[PDB]
DNA sequence: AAGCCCCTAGCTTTTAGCTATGGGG
DNA sequence: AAAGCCCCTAGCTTTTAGCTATGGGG
């Protein structure tokens, strides 16, 4: 796990973002699929945002990114889905004349860390009961380098 | 894990917070450490912050919460510290003279979900099927 | 626990098009 | 060190306070 800081925070935020174009309309396929994703990492570029992982299907693009928390990640999704949304608007005719808009007013997304839930969960509540470690090999490296970092 | 959801936004958004009082001070003690979660649970409550799991040491707070994205995890924060640093002060004494301020600038975030991160990355990118 | 319809100011993408723990249908 | 120590502005809460801001400096 990388951590980063800004002038104030320690933190390593990663998020797992998803949307659908207007009426789930299966216009992410080929050459739209293509500017739209290059739009995507301009603006992740520009605002600071790291991309993990990004791919798309016909009706959905999902995304892996790693943003500074105090800056936000809604901040991020609002400029992502505005911007690619009148550029392509602008280059494909299609998505101009056949929609409202391309995007809905809604996403989906989940924060996502090294480990699952229960174990910083468990981590959390084992604080002052000393060192009660969360089991054998599970996570060992996970743990470990939490305390180093959190102390 | 099970989402929730605000008008425009489904979402599952847990972080593992982690800040400690000025100079590492280990106050976090007795009847401070009870009036302290007490005061973050206030706070939590009412912000609509779901505190799934929150622990302190002598100089540490630990906080594993589900905060809206859209109202945001540094506007639970700062009301957190704040109010906590206003209240505890005002009622501790020892609080207020022996310290400047009773947290620091700074604090750690670390967002968690129900999968680890390579889960996910894999997850998305094995989308094209 | 969004996704459809409608609405607002705010802010970017500004003859647009998206957010807001936004309003309601 | 910088996240943490110092100092500062500016915005909003806790406001005869005390914490933020992809804040800036040291």
Redesign the interface.
Known sequence: ?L?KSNH?????????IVWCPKYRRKVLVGAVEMRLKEIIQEVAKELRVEI??????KD?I???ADID??F???KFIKTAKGRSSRILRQEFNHLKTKLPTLWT?????????????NV??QY?????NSNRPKQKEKWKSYVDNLQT??L
């Open positions: 796990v951590y104030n925070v320690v933190y390593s935020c990663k998020y797992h993990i992982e990004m791919q798309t299907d959905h999902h995304i892996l928390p105090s936000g990640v809604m007013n809604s996403c989906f997304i989940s924060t996502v860390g090294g480990a699952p839930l910083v969960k959390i509540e084992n604080q002052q970092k959190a």
